[PDB]
Structures are given as structure tokens and as C-alpha cells.
Amino acid sequence: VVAAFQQSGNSPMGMVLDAVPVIPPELRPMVQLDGGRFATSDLNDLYR
């Protein structure tokens, strides 16, 4: 494991995040029902 780390030329600091990204809005399409309800992918729920 350590030799893989060393050869990668990277640093382990990539295992602690400070800024998660969010996919575009279309990938998580937002859907309006007859009553305009939010029933699209819950990705919006988790980001909320």
C-alpha cells in the first residue's frame, strides 16, 4: 500500500475532503407532477 502511495506521486491528503462537488442539475432531473410535487431523484434530498 505504501509503495503504491509513493509511486502514485500523490499525497494521502486526498482521503480527507473539504469540498464535495455537486453534479449538474440535469443529471438529477427535477420533475413537476400534476400538482407540481417534487418526486425526482432524491439526490436533491441528500444535498438538501
Partner: protein
Amino acid sequence: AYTLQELLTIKSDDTVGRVKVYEAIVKGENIPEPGIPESFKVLLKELQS
């Protein structure tokens, strides 16, 4: 090979590819080579997440 490339890229996903090939066929110009399928770009922009 080229037939599979067309079937997977130039006639199913690539928007600009479809527009350009349709215009070339309408005219006498040769069909331009396909581009990057939308599937691959979506996979990228999703795995970068």
C-alpha cells in the same frame, strides 16, 4: 470498425454530429468524422463528482 463507430456515436447520441452529418448529406460534402458520444461525457462529468 467504422460501422460500429457510426452506430454507437454518430446516429444515437452526438447532437452536433447528427446535425453536421445531416447537413453534409443534404449537400454534397463528405460525412465528417463522429465526435465524443454524449454517454462518455456524461460518465465523465458524473464520475468527477
